């Protein structure tokens, strides 16, 4: 059981730019390292094997190298078909393992999310439960977070979150987060709010509503 | 000797106006630009406006553009800031200062400034709230009684204890402006805890602008 | 000299085909400042240079310290710069009884604005108005537009740091070329009819 | 519109020690940047103008220098009269901006605050509101914070702070931080606490009470 | 021999009155007359210890 640590978890580079992804074995794996390219909805494709061998059918743009336990994947010039998640795998010992994987983006202009708040509705509350939905739309880069507040103060242990894939022209994405309350908990509070934090945002976006509103 | 002296501050209602004036002596105005600089309590300095005394030309910070007009008079050796449609955001201490030429030079002389405030809550005397002591063991065996002085306007307010007789052990905090449009501050008196049942602890709040005072007795409570 | 140049427009006299002893300046001791770089000040009258450049100007007392190799500052960077490998001497003296006037001697100017730093021994005496801001000046002085120079308030009441000083800098140019400026090497009396 | 960044926000140096504060212009400021000294209750005094010119009336201990857009503000040796908040002004272009202000302190042994809690009293609650008060006493340096908690969760949006000036021999100070709840909100939460964070504190101080207690 | 701040107990010579003779010690502390300004044992213009 030899681990392949991968970094950076995400990389941004424009089309035609050079990309390097590094996989670090926790110990020697000899030269037995393979790289794979995975697209959404698709199987990983072998790119490179045995540290530096290009797999037939893989563009010449791809190459690899090794120094010590550091295995590197290089794309000399990114084309639109290369914006994929890349993985490293070692075949030295069993169990054979893979690293976390890293994602390559197109380095689209960085900007803050548009934020809409969807307060629990009267119809939704018929279920006996409640949820507050905060949606951050059309923004970039991938790292983003939402803090939640009740009676304008931070909440914890009562929320869920997910992130969409990236737009084919903009590389932007949306983020969804929500509070999970029973209807009975909804009834105990008066002010609900979503605080949005992002790298393209100079000041966190705060949106709110009163209980029973909207 | 060069001097700059401010006037024209005070309390205005939002949407109203105040006209600042800076008297000057020891130098002419011609050849210099006159400038106003703003400083909110707890914040750093911001330039507001400037006028070249020998040209009549002006420059303004974007933050006050439109609302404020700057002017100067070389025969009078004085300068003014006309602040219209004043907002809550314009509460600050305003200072006059001078620099040579239109710009590119620092400010050599500064006046001491004037406080400009905007508030719909007008002028109010204080109300006083007590603070219960800790009843638990502490370092040094000390304990404190206190008060919260609230809803008065404008600042300064003078706060002491035992109707002004107790200064020993007194720790008084600066006031801050609240959502009420009025000011508030905390204060405590820390003594060996047995003294909390021996000495008198009356929160002495003296507020000259409303011609009043509040003497609020604070006593130890179960805790 | 009766009058010295403004530091922004410092004068340069090229010296060649001549002889002088540097220790004369030292011995007169009219200066507040006398410091040599590359060459010692201690009667180094046995050296020859291709050229000597005697640069001269008037600055404030608090600015005298900037006229040297390795220095930075408003003059060292925008009015008068000396090179890291400078060989030469910086001599300066208080000129308050010459360069000060009642009401202020404003005949002396210095540069406040430029878009770049000066090269060693660069002289730029342009009077074009400097654009500090984003809009064009179009020849007009104003906020964000500065006529690049300013005068010195050389008043009769100035404290020492604000009194004018006359600065002369002697740059000694040693090249793989015939030298033309030397010192008056000391001679002795002719002695005849004896072993000499 | 040239902005100024000043760093650090606070600096310590004892009497006889040397102080250097750095002011960075976002663009060229030429040599039109000025250094001012401010004492509580007073207007800023000019120390140095146009980057390096010492202003008449300012002690010779004050000096400074430039590299690129970085203006170093130097006190060759501090005396008690030099403990002040220092600011940079950029007069090169309009609008004129300033840095944030650097407070110089004396390098006293660093130590944690004594912490006193003054929970809402029955008398205070007569107004219809609760005020939970935590005072941090006799401590140094200036950077400090209170992590307020309700039902042991971190609060925000419901608090206020005030800081006293510093002691003339020790330069220590006290910090006031409070929570605001209406009486109605006060009685809807069970556990109140003040978690104190400080440089001289080996473990955050936590003090607490239950609703209705004290 | 190395000390933080320099080994202050060790003395080094920077200047000499005349070139030192081979294998001969010189333990004199007299100030060196580097300049044209008489030194006479004390710090001055172009005088160095």
């Amino acid at each position: 059981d030899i681990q392949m640590t991968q970094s950076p978890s995400s990389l941004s580079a424009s089309v035609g730019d050079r990309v390097t992804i590094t996989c670090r074995a926790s110990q020697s794996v000899s030269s037995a390292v393979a790289w794979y390219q995975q697209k959404p909805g698709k199987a990983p494709k072998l790119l490179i094997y045995s540290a530096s061998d290009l797999y037939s059918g893989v563009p010449s743009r791809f190459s690899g190298s090794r120094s010590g336990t550091d295995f590197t994947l290089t794309i000399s010039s990114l084309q639109p078909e290369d914006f994929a998640t890349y993985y490293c795998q070692q075949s030295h010992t069993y169990p054979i393992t893979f690293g976390q994987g890293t994602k390559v983006e197109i380095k689209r202009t960085v900007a803050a999310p548009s934020v809409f708040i969807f307060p629990p509705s009267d119809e939704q509350l018929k279920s006996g439960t409640a949820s507050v939905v905060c949606l951050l739309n059309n923004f970039y880069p991938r790292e983003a977070k939402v803090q939640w507040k009740v009676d304008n103060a931070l909440q914890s242990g009562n929320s869920q979150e997910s992130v969409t894939e990236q737009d084919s022209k903009d590389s932007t994405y949306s983020l969804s987060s929500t509070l999970t309350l029973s209807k009975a908990d909804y009834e105990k509070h008066k002010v609900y709010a979503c605080e949005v934090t992002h790298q393209g945002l100079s000041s966190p976006v705060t949106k709110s509503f009163n209980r029973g509103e909207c | 000797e060069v001097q700059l002296v401010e006037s024209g501050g005070g309390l205005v209602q939002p949407g109203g106006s105040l006209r600042l004036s800076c008297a000057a002596s020891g130098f002419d105005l011609g050849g210099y630009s006159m400038h106003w600089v703003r400083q909110a309590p707890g914040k750093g300095l911001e330039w507001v406006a400037g006028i070249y005394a020998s040209g009549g030309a002006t420059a303004y910070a974007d933050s006050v553009k439109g609302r404020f007009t700057i002017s100067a008079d070389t025969s009078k050796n004085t300068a003014y800031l006309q602040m219209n449609s004043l907002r809550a955001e314009d509460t600050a201490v305003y200072y006059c200062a001078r620099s040579y030429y239109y710009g590119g030079f620092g400010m050599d002389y500064w006046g001491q400034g004037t406080l400009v405030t905007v508030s719909s809550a007008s002028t109010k005397g204080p109300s006083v709230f007590p603070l219960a002591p800790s009843s638990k063991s502490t370092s040094g065996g000390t304990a404190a009684l206190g008060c919260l002085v609230k809803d008065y306007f404008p600042e300064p307010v003078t706060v002491s204890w035992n109707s002004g007789a107790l200064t020993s052990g007194v720790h008084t905090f600066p006031a801050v402006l609240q959502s009420s449009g009025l000011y508030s501050l905390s204060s405590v008196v820390t003594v060996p805890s047995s003294s909390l049942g021996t000495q008198t602890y009356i929160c002495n709040v003296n507020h000259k602008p409303s011609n009043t005072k509040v003497d609020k007795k604070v006593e130890p409570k179960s805790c | 000299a009766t009058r010295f140049a403004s530091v922004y427009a410092w004068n340069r006299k090229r010296i060649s085909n001549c002889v002088a002893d540097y220790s004369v300046l030292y011995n007169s001791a009219s200066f507040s400042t006398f410091k040599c770089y590359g060459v010692s000040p201690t009667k180094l009258n046995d050296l020859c240079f291709t050229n000597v450049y005697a640069d001269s100007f008037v600055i404030r007392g608090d600015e005298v310290r900037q006229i040297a190799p390795g220095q930075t500052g408003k003059i060292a960077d925008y009015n008068y710069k000396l090179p890291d490998d400078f060989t030469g001497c910086v001599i300066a003296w208080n000129s308050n009884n010459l360069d000060s006037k009642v009401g202020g001697n404003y005949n002396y100017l210095y540069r406040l604005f430029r878009k770049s730093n000066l090269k060693p021994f660069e002289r730029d005496i342009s009077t074009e108005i400097y654009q500090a801001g984003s809009t064009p000046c179009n020849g007009v002085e104003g906020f964000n537009c500065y006529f690049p120079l300013q005068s010195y308030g050389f008043q009769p009441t100035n404290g020492v740091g604000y009194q004018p000083y006359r600065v002369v800098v002697l740059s000694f140019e040693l090249l793989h070329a015939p030298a033309t400026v030397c010192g008056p090497k000391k001679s002795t009396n002719l002695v005849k009819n004896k072993c000499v």
Side-chain angles (χ1 to χ4, degrees), chain C residues 15-99:
Chain C
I15 298 171
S16 66
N17 293 313
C18 68
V19 59
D21 187 338
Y22 181 75
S23 71
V24 171
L25 293 169
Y26 178 68
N27 290 335
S28 293
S30 66
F31 51 77
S32 65
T33 298
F34 193 86
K35 175 71 179 177
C36 299
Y37 303 90
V39 59
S40 172
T42 60
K43 302 181 181 180
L44 275 288
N45 63 358
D46 58 0
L47 305 178
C48 297
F49 300 100
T50 302
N51 287 290
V52 180
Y53 300 89
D55 293 344
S56 64
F57 51 87
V58 178
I59 61 172
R60 292 172 291 156
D62 289 344
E63 295 180 314
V64 172
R65 70 185 179 86
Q66 293 178 45
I67 310 304
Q71 306 304 301
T72 64
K74 291 194 297 195
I75 294 168
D77 297 306
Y78 301 104
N79 293 271
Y80 183 77
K81 181 175 178 69
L82 299 176
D84 292 349
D85 56 339
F86 177 74
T87 299
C89 300
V90 179
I91 303 97
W93 63 98
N94 190 323
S95 60
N96 186 60
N97 63 318
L98 301 176
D99 294 325

Side-chain angles (χ1 to χ4, degrees), chain A residues 113-129:
Chain A
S114 174
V115 180
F116 292 106
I117 306 302
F118 302 97
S121 67
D122 289 345
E123 294 180 12
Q124 182 170 336
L125 293 171
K126 290 178 179 179
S127 68
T129 71

